[PDB]
Design a protein around this ligand. Structure first.
Ligand SMILES: *[C@@H]1O[C@H](CO)[C@@H](O)[C@H](O)[C@H]1NC(C)=O
Ligand SMILES: *[C@@H]1O[C@H](CO)[C@@H](O)[C@H](O)[C@H]1NC(C)=O
Ligand SMILES: *[C@@H]1O[C@H](CO)[C@@H](O)[C@H](O)[C@H]1NC(C)=O
Ligand SMILES: *[C@@H]1O[C@H](CO)[C@@H](O)[C@H](O)[C@H]1NC(C)=O
Ligand SMILES: *[C@@H]1O[C@H](CO)[C@@H](O)[C@H](O)[C@H]1NC(C)=O
Ligand SMILES: *[C@@H]1O[C@H](CO)[C@@H](O)[C@H](O)[C@H]1NC(C)=O
Ligand SMILES: *[C@@H]1O[C@H](CO)[C@@H](O)[C@H](O)[C@H]1NC(C)=O
Ligand SMILES: *[C@@H]1O[C@H](CO)[C@@H](O)[C@H](O)[C@H]1NC(C)=O
Lengths: 114, 422, 274, 111, 274, 114, 111, 422
């Protein structure tokens, strides 16, 4: 019932493409990463690309694992819809979730004493 | 039908039946296997045709065209239905909203009702896409048609995609005493330029690197030009593709510069090396230079032409060195180097005569002297009228005076002193 | 980003009836706005602090404070969204103030304080204070934003907090390394009271150049409970070819509180001439 | 043609893991700068877009190696928007392509 | 500083009932304030213009415009003091707006314009807009100030205005001065259609130094009505001692519209070698 | 009567000295000026020092009148009280007036043509 | 001990003479800078104080002649102030010494 | 009573009667001549005593103390009254509020009732002040007592005011080969310093000018030091007072430097000048220098010592110039200059003998020759044994050979050539 909880609102359904209609970086990066199937038919989007750092260090020009650098993950908070009630394709409820998007290579923290 | 579809997104089903498309990336999810209280449509299989899109003359991209066949099943005469194509594939995520309306004529229970075609699912090269097709509302589970796409490796892929080889033209120009790098980029097009000397280990060896706003016709210096010279260009945009062109591999002027820059260096008495920028294999052998004149006579026979390789260390089969021994390097027999290694170690050039020993008939020793006009087997009659100064060198040799330079089971070389005759 | 504790976080101060409701960071007024629009929060300011919790642990906390404008719009004021958006992760944190009695009289500048937000050291945030009801679309803003930032553990008052001590700030190795005459190097260091692996990292260079000549790693598995604070000597051979000599080492720790990101403790000894 | 949504959010990222990150934008081999994308018509109102500072990556000495490339990690995320009062719907769900961070990659070479 | 004309200067625009009362620059609310306090005038801006008056004369005029904040305080708004304080003299100028109907609804940003303030060229002003009722002492300000400034007559659109033409901007002398061989200088110039005295001013210096060698003035009494636009040749002897030669003269006019302040029209001819 | 015109207010009478309790410049200036008695028993203060430029030009170091410079007056707007009703030492009415305070020497405006 | 005043001002400087001044602070031999003395408790709220920029005057070439002096012309003017509500009076008349302009003077010499 | 009153502002009337003061600069104006329905006070005359105020030891200012005598006139026993003193005077404008309360004992109709005294009206030196005293409310018109004040010219004014002479001390120090300017300013006290050469026309002639933060002991260069050197100092505050001290007027080292810098220059044959920085009058005369030696014999007699003045052009009473004629300049007879003017115009020095003619007894001509040991009247017996070469010069003279240098009714000078005798 609407008006019982004012948090229930109508949504257009036809997504407004913010030029999403108008990569191979995971394997080419010096801090590469692998994608995992964090899939769920109840959550929108159904398929997710969980990216966690493949190498602990960073790969140099020769292909060696260079321990003078560290690969670090990049996480974000994104909004998703989850069915409410379950299996009913008419209504949903918002959710904020943690996702691992990609990796980058960083110089370590050092404390130089003579 | 064609492999050159237009820039617009529109549907075109099989004849007879009418249909529409709402390409608004609608929210799509499975839901539940609902009941069918009447004739309802359902998919049978999925297809993936090779189609290309071109917005303008100089701008073309891919279009993985998909098709879904439908059929009447379940428990006005025009049968209506709503179909979805959830393309949850890498990199971008987009959905499609079809609207099939098969009329009464094609209505057959337990049989097909035509087909629907969407143009297009622009997928990147080298990405195993996921095509999940299911009815709206859902009846059958999403049909799996996980298509494996070719990278920039398909035969027809090279014929259309500009990423494959087509990169701003750098025309080869070894005209006159100036080597020109003619560029065909636009006036406002920026780019990165790098020139380097490739080889076996440690491929990168840059000579010049710079950012430029072309088209500039860059004139190269013959100091940095050799057969190893390779060019790499790329537009100033992140992740832009490059190409490594190594054309000087068999250029005459490049090989001429390579040898004039290459040098020979003695490491130790029994070790030497060929130091050249471009590692190109070639042969070499020991030679005997006269102190007076300079017609260097090769010592083949009795010595052998060694298989030399740049940066590969070689050893001499000599007991000791001699200033008159000079190494000769040739590629395709044409002579390139005649540097005398022992000119600093034991030089200058000594006028000590060289002998070539070999076992003559009846097991006896048979000697010979290296003259400007070949060799003269002595003891013998001489051009000096008398039995030659070789008669006295013959005594010096058996009395242990002569210096043994090379030793072999079949022969030997000796440096005899002539400093007691003039 | 987290509350210090789900305790009596109530805003009922003298001459003011209200309560601080923990919210989803999306007030009802954002969804269905009103013609009224309160004033912006003038002179917003944040100041870091450290409050000892019930457990006894000390944590870095963000103390927020501001003053309302003395305009008539102060009457039509429902409350505020004290948002603390972290920029590294875009994670949203906030609390919804809600007034029982509507503000009247003025006379003294009304002020609110909030000493209940744990912050992660060395992270840039944006503390926005959105007064309620939120404005209409195509309407003036009634908020002020401030890019707050927490300093690194090298600061004296940060090193003492809980997030720094578990990371490995207190820990000092005391690298009793020795240039052994047998072309070897005697690595050594004391370890912290936490079971985890430590890895030694060697790199060598000439006395007059930044370029290297050799590299080598040496693993050290997790020490036992009794082996906490123990000295770990792990001697390694140096392929000291004549020319190279300026050796440089850094013991890279891998504690749970950080992993590869952790504080590396370096030591260097130049080429001894003569 | 329209779907109902309960905006009573459930915060599922309330894990607060032991690992707590530091300012990576300057420590990385591919540095980046962040832009405040603020829009009160959209929820979340503020989104911080990270964009690569250099075309190349930083070498051990501390210079821009033009032989390597810095690339942004672009992520499509779900966001809400207040659809005009005249239009039939009150809210519209939108997909936005935004730059999250940067990473150092080897460039491609076509023979 | 003065009104363009005491005419129908009324602010009654659509969706707004009000009138612009000319005031003493001290609203009753300054003297006896109220607990209410309206919002400040957001994005205040001024732009110069030139409006031809009933007489036919053109004058430099200041066009002021601004937008109100969309907060609830916009309801409790009586009007505004459009002050234009000149800084050279601290002279106060202003107009008091007074609303019949109090503002409601919002929807579009309310805006007011005022094209009725004559300004003196080359003068810095401070245009403050004080919303009414004025705030209480120890209260937030509901005003915005802008240091307005009018350019000199050398600007094309200023030279044409009335204050510039009477000062002597249109006037061009056409100094047909001649280096007479008798160690004399033939000064000459056409005069403007206004009866006033003009004074010639001579100064001489060497060809390689800024320091002077001689000075002399020559008066010219007020010309008659027929003598307007006439050429006034006033030849003067030069005590040209060998060494000095670079003569320099400036006809200093003394019109009523300025007096000694007026625009001097200079002319210089260097030492001719050879 | 008070309240008939709200513009009638009480004033402390004992002036708050903004350190007025805590010059010969007119004769020493390069642009000297003379003072005139613009006195009036009805206006507060009773005595005024009207300063108008004595020299048209400016006096140089030698004492000569230098015509390459101009003396200009400095005027200000100040508030004063005037008796209301007349000769009644109980009530007053505000007035804004023009006063010539002092002079300064300025470079003339020039238009250099070759 | 108290005097009544009608604040219904009569603007007597409405002469608007033909002479219209220009920016003298930079043209003068003794240049000056102006400070905004703003106080809402006082009427006039804003007063622009001119203070000498240099100790010396500007010579014909354009330099600070330290043998001459720039002095401010300080004028005492009448101003009103809102006396606190607790104090018996509502308004208090004050005399303020403020800097109006600057002038160049010859310095004094004591033999 | 005293000429050294305290820093506080308070009233002190004559004995017996009590009184008070409210020094709040009250609003004061005449108003109207009101009626007196009873005994009311009124002023008779005004007084102005010499009083000084001192806040601290090193800080003192003026206090023009005023007094007003009152009396009962007009149409409890304690008679009360309110008096005012409107000091509308230049530069500052301030009023005073007295409160006289003369008790019953001194109440006498048509007679005085004591006096009231205010401390103080701080007035500036050299400002004719205006003292306008009238009752509150007004009865009599304000009494005129327009007091004329002395500038820094009163005898007692110098004894107390620091503006009068007392300026940071610069002690004279011409010790050794270094002239020191010892300064006594505080460490944080900033000041302007200027040194110059004064004279008749164009007094300013600077040599050094600079801003300093004292106390710095500045050592002067003897290049810029002469009797005209004057110092001027002033603190870095606008309108601050300065002082011009010229002490080198009679210093021995300054006059020594003055003459070594002064030079003599010939303008034309009949005109010359003395170029010196400091214009100090002195005398000069023509001299005759020998070519061999240098004992310059003055030509007095017969020529006269001229009154010379620096920068004043002088003329020679000579028909023509001679290289042996040199000008000698002396001040107090001590010789300073002996520069030979015609050394460039007709030099070098010629060995032509000079003669001194004068009319001898019996109207005849009597000649003499300038020798190193005075003059020798010739024709005469000679030290050369013969009748001298003067016998032959006597002939050269009357035969028109000799050059007439000076002409007079009583005598003449002649340059005779001796280049035909050695
Ligand atoms: C250079 O240009 C000519 C045409 O002028 C063309 O035939 C040739 O193939 C070009 N070479 C390269 C390497 O592009
Ligand atoms: C390259 O540029 C030259 C410019 O003269 C032009 O002649 C040539 O046709 C261009 N070639 C291409 C392929 O653009
Ligand atoms: C080595 O020498 C032989 C001599 O017969 C020749 O055939 C061969 O080409 C040489 N080079 C190499 C690289 O084998
Ligand atoms: C507020 O906190 C309580 C527990 O103290 C919890 O039940 C509630 O869900 C919280 N709400 C939000 C939005 O954090
Ligand atoms: C307003 O203007 C009218 C004339 O149009 C005048 O009578 C009135 O006194 C003016 N008031 C002020 C304060 O300027
Ligand atoms: C210099 O100082 C001495 C005392 O040391 C004093 O007697 C003398 O008068 C001073 N001279 C001057 C010029 O102040
Ligand atoms: C001047 O300064 C010197 C510093 O040594 C001091 O001895 C002397 O007494 C001072 N004189 C005065 C008058 O201050
Ligand atoms: C001029 O000369 C006479 C010679 O007797 C002398 O008395 C006098 O002092 C000299 N100086 C001046 C300036 O008169």
């Amino acid at each position: 019932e609407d008006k019982n909880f004012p948090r229930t609102v109508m949504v257009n359904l036809n997504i407004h493409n913010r030029n999403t209609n108008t990569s191979d970086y995971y394997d080419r990066s010096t801090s590469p990463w692998n994608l995992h199937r964090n899939e769920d038919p109840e959550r929108y989007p159904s398929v997710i690309w969980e990216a966690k750092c493949r190498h602990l260090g960073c790969i140099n020009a020769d292909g060696n694992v260079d321990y003078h650098m560290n690969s670090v993950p990049i996480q974000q908070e994104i909004l998703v819809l989850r069915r409410e009630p379950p299996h009913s394709p008419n209504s949903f409820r918002l959710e904020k979730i943690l996702v691992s998007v990609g990796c980058t290579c960083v110089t370590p923290i050092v404390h130089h004493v003579a | 039908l064609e492999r050159l579809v237009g820039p617009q997104d529109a549907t075109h089903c099989s004849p007879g039946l009418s249909c529409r498309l709402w390409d608004s990336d609608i929210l799509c999810l499975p839901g539940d296997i609902v009941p069918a209280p009447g004739p309802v449509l359902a998919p049978t299989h999925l297809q993936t045709e090779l189609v290309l899109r071109c917005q303008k003359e100089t701008d073309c991209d891919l279009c993985l065209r998909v098709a879904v066949h439908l059929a009447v099943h379940g428990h006005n005469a025009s049968l209506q239905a709503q179909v979805v194509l959830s393309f949850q594939a890498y990199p971008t995520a987009r959905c499609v909203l079809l609207e099939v309306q098969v009329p009464a004529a094609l209505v057959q229970f337990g049989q097909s009702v035509g087909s629907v075609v969407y143009d297009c699912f622009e997928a990147a090269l080298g990405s195993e896409v996921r095509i999940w097709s299911y009815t709206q509302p859902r009846y059958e589970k999403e049909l799996n048609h996980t298509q494996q796409l070719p990278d920039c490796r398909g035969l027809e892929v090279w014929n259309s995609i500009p990423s494959c080889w087509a990169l701003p033209w750098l025309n080869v120009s070894a005209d006159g005493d100036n080597v020109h790098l003619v560029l065909n980029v636009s006036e406002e097009q920026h780019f990165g330029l790098s020139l380097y000397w490739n080889q076996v280990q440690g491929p990168p060896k840059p000579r010049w690197h710079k950012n430029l706003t072309g088209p500039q016709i860059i004139t190269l210096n013959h100091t940095d030009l050799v057969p190893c010279l390779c060019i790499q260009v790329w537009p100033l945009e992140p992740d832009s593709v490059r190409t490594n062109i190594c054309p000087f591999r068999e250029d005459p002027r490049a090989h001429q510069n390579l040898w004039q820059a290459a040098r020979l260096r003695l490491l130790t008495l029994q070790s030497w090396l060929l130091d050249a920028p471009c590692s190109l294999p070639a042969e070499a052998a020991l030679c005997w230079r006269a102190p007076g004149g300079d017609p260097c006579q090769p010592l083949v026979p009795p010595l052998s032409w060694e298989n030399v390789t740049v940066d590969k260390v070689l050893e001499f089969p000599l007991l000791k060195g001699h200033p008159n021994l000079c190494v000769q390097v040739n590629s395709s027999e044409k002579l390139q180097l005649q540097e005398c290694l022992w000119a600093d170690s034991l030089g200058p050039l000594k006028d000590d005569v060289l002998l070539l020993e070999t076992r003559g008939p009846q097991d006896n020793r048979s000697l010979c002297a290296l003259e400007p006009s070949g060799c003269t087997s002595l003891p013998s009659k001489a051009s000096t009228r008398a039995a030659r100064l070789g008669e006295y060198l013959l005594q010096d040799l058996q009395s242990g005076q002569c210096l043994q330079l090379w030793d072999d089971d079949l022969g030997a070389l000796w440096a005899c002193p002539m400093d007691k005759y003039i | 980003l987290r509350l210090l504790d789900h305790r009596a976080l109530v805003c009922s101060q003298p001459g003011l009836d209200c309560t601080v409701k923990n919210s989803t960071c999306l007030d009802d007024s954002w969804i269905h706005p009103r013609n009224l629009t309160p004033s912006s929060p003038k002179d917003l300011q944040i100041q870091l602090h450290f409050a000892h919790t019930q457990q006894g642990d000390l944590f870095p906390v963000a103390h927020i404070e501001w003053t309302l404008q003395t305009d008539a719009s102060i009457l039509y004021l429902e409350g505020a969204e004290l948002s603390v958006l972290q920029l590294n992760t875009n994670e949203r944190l906030c609390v919804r103030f809600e007034f029982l009695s509507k503000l009247r009289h003025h006379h003294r500048r009304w002020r609110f304080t909030f000493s209940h937000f744990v912050v992660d050291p060395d992270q840039e945030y944006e503390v926005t204070v959105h007064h309620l009801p939120k404005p209409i679309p195509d309407g003036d803003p009634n908020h002020q934003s401030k890019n707050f930032l927490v300093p690194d553990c090298e600061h004296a008052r940060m090193k003492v907090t809980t997030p720094c001590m578990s990371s490995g700030s207190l820990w000092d190795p005391d690298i009793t390394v020795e240039t052994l005459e047998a072309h070897q190097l005697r690595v050594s260091f004391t370890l912290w009271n936490e079971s985890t692996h430590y890895q030694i990292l060697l790199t060598s260079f000439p006395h007059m150049e930044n370029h290297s000549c050799f590299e080598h790693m040496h693993h050290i598995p997790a020490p036992r409970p009794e082996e906490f604070h123990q000295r770990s000597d792990v001697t390694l051979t140096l392929r000291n070819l004549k020319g190279c000599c300026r050796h440089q080492v850094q013991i890279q720790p891998f504690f749970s509180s950080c992993l590869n990101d952790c504080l590396r403790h370096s030591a260097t000894v130049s080429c001894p001439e003569m």
